Design a protein around this ligand. Sequence first.
Ligand SMILES: CC1=C(C#C/C(C)=C/C=C/C(C)=C/C=C/C=C(C)/C=C/C=C(C)/C=C/C2=C(C)CCCC2(C)C)C(C)(C)C[C@H](O)C1
Ligand SMILES: CC1=CCCC(C)(C)[C@H]1/C=C/C(C)=C/C=C/C(C)=C/C=C/C=C(C)/C=C/C=C(C)/C=C/C1=C(C)CCCC1(C)C
Ligand SMILES: CC1=CCCC(C)(C)[C@H]1/C=C/C(C)=C/C=C/C(C)=C/C=C/C=C(C)/C=C/C=C(C)/C=C/C1=C(C)CCCC1(C)C
Ligand SMILES: [Fe+2]
Lengths: 57, 77, 30, 342, 504, 120, 65, 173, 38
Amino acid sequence: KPRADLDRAMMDPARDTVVSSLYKSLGGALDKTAVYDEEDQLLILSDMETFPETELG
Amino acid sequence: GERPFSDIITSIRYWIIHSITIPALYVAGWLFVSTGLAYDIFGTPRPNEYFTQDRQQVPLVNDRFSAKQELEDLTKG
Amino acid sequence: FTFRWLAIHGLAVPTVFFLGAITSMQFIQR
Amino acid sequence: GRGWFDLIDDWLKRDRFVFVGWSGLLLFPTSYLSIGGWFTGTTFVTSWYTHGLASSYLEGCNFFTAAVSTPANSMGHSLLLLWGPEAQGDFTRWCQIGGLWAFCALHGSFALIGFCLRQFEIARLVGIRPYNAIAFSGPIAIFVSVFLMYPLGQASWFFAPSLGVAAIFRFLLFIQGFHNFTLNPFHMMGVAGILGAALLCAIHGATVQNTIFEDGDAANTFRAFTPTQAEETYSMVTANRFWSQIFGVAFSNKRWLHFFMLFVPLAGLWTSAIGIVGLALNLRAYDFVSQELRAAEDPEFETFYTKNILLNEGIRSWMAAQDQPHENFIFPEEVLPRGNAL
Amino acid sequence: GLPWYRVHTVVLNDPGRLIAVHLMHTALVAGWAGSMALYELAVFDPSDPVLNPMWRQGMFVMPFMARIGVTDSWGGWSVTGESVANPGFWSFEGVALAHIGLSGLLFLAAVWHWVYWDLELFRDPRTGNPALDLPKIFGIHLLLSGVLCFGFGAFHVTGAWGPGIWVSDAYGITGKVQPVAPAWGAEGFNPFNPSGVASHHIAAGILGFLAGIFHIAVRPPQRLYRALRMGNIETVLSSSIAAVFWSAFITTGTMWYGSATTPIELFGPTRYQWDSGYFQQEIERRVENSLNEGLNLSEAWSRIPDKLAFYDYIGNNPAKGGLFRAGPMNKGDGIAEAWLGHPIFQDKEGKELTVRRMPAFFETFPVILVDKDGIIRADIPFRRAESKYSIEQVGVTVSFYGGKLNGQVFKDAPTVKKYARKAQLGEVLEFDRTTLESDGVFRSSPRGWYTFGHANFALLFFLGHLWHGSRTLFRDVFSGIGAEVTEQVEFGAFQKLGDRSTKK
Amino acid sequence: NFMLVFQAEHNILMHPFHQLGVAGVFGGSLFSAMHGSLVTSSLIRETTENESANYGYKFGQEEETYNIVAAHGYFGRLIFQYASFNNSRALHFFLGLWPVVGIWFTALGVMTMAFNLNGF
Amino acid sequence: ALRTRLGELLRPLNSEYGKVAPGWGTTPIMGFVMLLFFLFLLIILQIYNSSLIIENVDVDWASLG
Amino acid sequence: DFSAAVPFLKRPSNLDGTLAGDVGFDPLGFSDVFDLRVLREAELKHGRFAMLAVLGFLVQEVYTFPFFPKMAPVDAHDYFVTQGGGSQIIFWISFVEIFGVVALFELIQGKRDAGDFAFDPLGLGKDEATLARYKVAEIKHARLAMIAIGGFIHQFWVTKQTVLEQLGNFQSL
Amino acid sequence: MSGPNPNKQPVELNRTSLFWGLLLIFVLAVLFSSYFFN
Ligand SMILES: CC1=C(C#C/C(C)=C/C=C/C(C)=C/C=C/C=C(C)/C=C/C=C(C)/C=C/C2=C(C)CCCC2(C)C)C(C)(C)C[C@H](O)C1
Ligand SMILES: CC1=CCCC(C)(C)[C@H]1/C=C/C(C)=C/C=C/C(C)=C/C=C/C=C(C)/C=C/C=C(C)/C=C/C1=C(C)CCCC1(C)C
Ligand SMILES: CC1=CCCC(C)(C)[C@H]1/C=C/C(C)=C/C=C/C(C)=C/C=C/C=C(C)/C=C/C=C(C)/C=C/C1=C(C)CCCC1(C)C
Ligand SMILES: [Fe+2]
């Protein structure tokens, strides 16, 4: 299993190798994924608008 | 944004380059047909090439992977 | 020089070529 | 600033005269090549070595008789690539074996995919629901079934429709003769869908044009409408009353009316596609078994269905000799069915 | 209220009842498998595997049971024709009863998951709403499917721990379940090589296991999460339907064109074996090889097996049936009893004549006899036409070699016409008609019915995939559009279409 | 049987009036599906997620139930900006005009082939 | 929401709803794998179509022997 | 700070140089991703197996037990597949490495040095300088024998003759 | 827990839909009865 305390902030990109770059490309050291989407992605909009009634009508 | 039609049709270059290019394309197609180049490029038979002396029937291709050789045999002469 | 220019010229040069070819074919003695 | 993908996405989705989008990369070259290949086939390419036919303006055909003919039967279901083992890079032999039909068919399949993706993309960018792509799935079903799934179930690409006019008429009569497709109930549902869609189009146009409100003083009423107006331009109540007391039933919901106009042709096309897919394997509604048994047991028993069966036999027997020249069908005059022969 | 076509959307955000309805569907499918197997066992006749095999009797799930090992029955018979003294539990009846019991257990599980829907597992620890971590669920399921595929291909197909799969010869004479060694070269992509099945399943199981590890380990990108709407389960439905109809097209093709996974001793021959004269060429080659050994025609044609001559017959063609000619193949031309032998047609001068075989397109074909050159020397008139080359005029005589009529020569015109009509269909056979009251119109094999059903199902699932992709990518405008569309639809209002920040 | 005998004796498929009728029915289906999809695509949001969208329109309401400008913009960007009908009245006149004229022409073609003026 | 033994066992396997990798993540390598899969499908399709003939790969019923 | 062994490559960030044989050689960079302690455990165990295997090849070529039949070492593998001695050997290797799994788990937890089973029965290494020198010699011999055992096996596979036999008559093909 | 599921929704079918469904099923029966019988 890949090591702990690995992140793409302390690891110098200038010292990258084949395996290290392949690990970065395959989503390794993803400790920055604490962000969530924060979008409902099932929210159907319900902002109905009422048309004003005219005198003709 | 877009280019209006009046600017297109009132451009002096737009007319001279068309007058020197488009009739050239028209004559190019006319000579592509009239010199017999279309028949040779696309394999379309000439009116005197549908039937040969030895083949008086429809030239059917009967094998898949030797189709090029069969067509060369049928279209020779 | 735009994308509309290319879209027109894709359907224009071979169109004129084919129209000339067909007009030439109209005079082939059948 | 922005990434390269974001810049490409911004340029493709630019609001210009001809929208390109991401779907344009698949649509425009494929549709362009399909149309160009069809014109090239109907203009120069012969059918002498596949069907023994002339199908180009170079051979003397008009608009009706010129076609991009299907490949030869010996080719099977080959993709017929220009670099493939049949043509081996020779453009002339590729045109002579019918590879241009495969060119047009594959590029048209991917062009239909591209156009449906274009509908999805423009509906997503504009912000409306994508019911137009669902509607266009109908013609996609027609093209897929007829031009791909039918020949892929048959012996080769040879029995697919050829891209012409008289060629399509040949396909109609060939399918009727060898399949009795009029008797197929899925084709009946397709005919019902098409004719009911024409009926709906005509009746909705007439009803709207004849129940408009008097929104202007001019006798010609086309100018009495603005696209940005809030009120309806025609009376739904008057139309509903008219069709309730004329026909018995009438639409009262405009949205249901337009979804029905969307649904009828789509259902017709999909059911007819099911029918053609059934025909692809010769699984047909060719005959009613009890009618044939009663006609065999009773020579005096005759219906219009039996006459249709005899007409199909006539089509097959008088058409197969020149329609399938690779089989070398030699039918003598005595084996050919004739009405006076019995 | 909900319309009739949206009644199942109540379990869209209810994971427990989604699992419950999936369990109910699985129970229904397993119960159908069991009941179909029981019915087919009730209507199967294992007496004659040569001339009445399972595809002549309309067996549909029996070929799939016999494809990967299950060939014996508790009645003491096998589909290969042998006798089994000790059948074991995994017979056809054992599989059917196992499917029935599995259906019952899945039904009870569905009941439990419908009642106990509010499990704490289905609720997000961060928000508390009922949610499913679909990417990690996909990782788990991909890992499970990789393990299952690798195990199937490494133990079941190879025979390391399992029966193997059905392997036949090139002409469907001697087929049985054998262990299959995998082929790791390019010959594993030969679709008629059964070693490709084992090698494919091993390699794909390994790759799926690795990909499942990756998908459990790694979260999706934010761009792909927003683009594909990975928080919505309808994108999973859309992509699953897409993959399912892709697979349905693949199986339709491999069934119609034939492969090592669709042997002809279980699903019947293909139409392209009749179009190319596959069995006819094989039979002619064998007869020629026997004639080159000094044998006469009778001994050469008597050496041809009845199975091989039965394959060379247009009634076994899947492309000769009808859409509403329901039932087994024996409901059509009948139940095959015996091979009558190869007819050879000779005129009054002794020249041999061959009846031109009927193509699969033709419901009716004219009976014409050609010589070795290809010239019409005799034929049958249409129904009542005046004739020039009729059978009575040319004096065609037919002599049968091999089969039941071996050595017999028929010279009377009605019999010669009857046998020419039969030879138009291929090899002449004897059919039984009073057992099932066969009407006399050809019917399709299980191969053709499978192809029809799955081609139509794939075509319809293409529409389903389009519908669910549309409902996924357009979830916000499901009930209609608002007033924010009027500004976007103005031509040239924005530089980029649909982007409010690119206003001119 | 009528269709088959008519094709045998008059070659109706090659008759340009029957071709106009086929264009009429195919175009009528195309335009019916097109108009239905454009109206259903641009329906104004007036319902909740748990009911049919048809109930957003009330029988006899004054306002329009769908955004004509939105459908016009979508169809203008689909093909080109004046391939659409800005006017709904002109659009519906075209809808009622295309298949009616097509069926008129094919009926007149059958009427002319009654007196043996056959197709091409 | 009732808590069960199996539910508590499987809870960490369903606990990261909405958790995403920032930016483009692994999209380029995903596209590379998709390209390889497209090439593989093309190869096997052209083999099954007999548009791609390989040594010792006879796409035929007769290859069964 | 470039690598001492490779002058054009940077020194790997996890190879500080405290380990025995840590010269900075890691072009592919397996130490950047996987744990260095587990990698050194695997390296040392591979090397110990290879050293025992090379010594075994030499001894088996020069002397076979009289109650065993006389043959080459490589094709004896199938003979002891059939006979059952190889099953015993792998059985006892598996028995030792069942506790090897626990040792590896303790290595993961960081309570054990890499390759350190504390196996010094003769008391050869007790001084720290001698211990470091022995560690360096052990890792160098492990690498050399890891190469050498594959060399022996492949040379027997291509030449159908053993090691000292090939050194007897050097046949080149 | 075992009780009120929040996703419970009523199901409607107005008379127009009932008549359309009846017409569809009866017309389909009329169409396919001739083919099922033969
Ligand atoms: C399968 C099988 C068996 C087996 C077996 C076995 C055990 C097979 C084992 C095979 C092995 C261990 C092969 C090892 C090869 C090592 C190489 C090529 C290292 C090269 C290093 C180099 C070039 C260094 C290069 C260098 C580098 C990088 C650093 C410095 C510079 C330089 C020196 C140039 C049996 C015998 C049991 C029988 C069984 O029935 C079948
Ligand atoms: C196929 C192939 C070969 C190798 C190259 C390549 C791989 C690119 C590939 C594609 C080549 C391509 C794209 C060729 C392009 C061909 C094109 C665009 C040909 C277009 C020709 C246009 C023509 C006739 C115009 C016809 C219009 C006519 C009469 C007018 C009809 C009229 C109308 C519309 C109303 C009634 C009155 C009237 C006047 C009769
Ligand atoms: C006509 C038609 C419409 C259009 C499509 C198509 C043409 C294909 C055709 C297909 C129709 C369809 C979908 C038919 C579906 C048939 C099905 C699902 C049949 C399945 C029946 C299930 C059965 C028996 C289950 C039996 C299980 C039982 C007792 C279990 C009992 C038990 C339980 C409950 C508790 C434990 C103990 C025990 C004994 C196990
Ligand atoms: Fe309207």
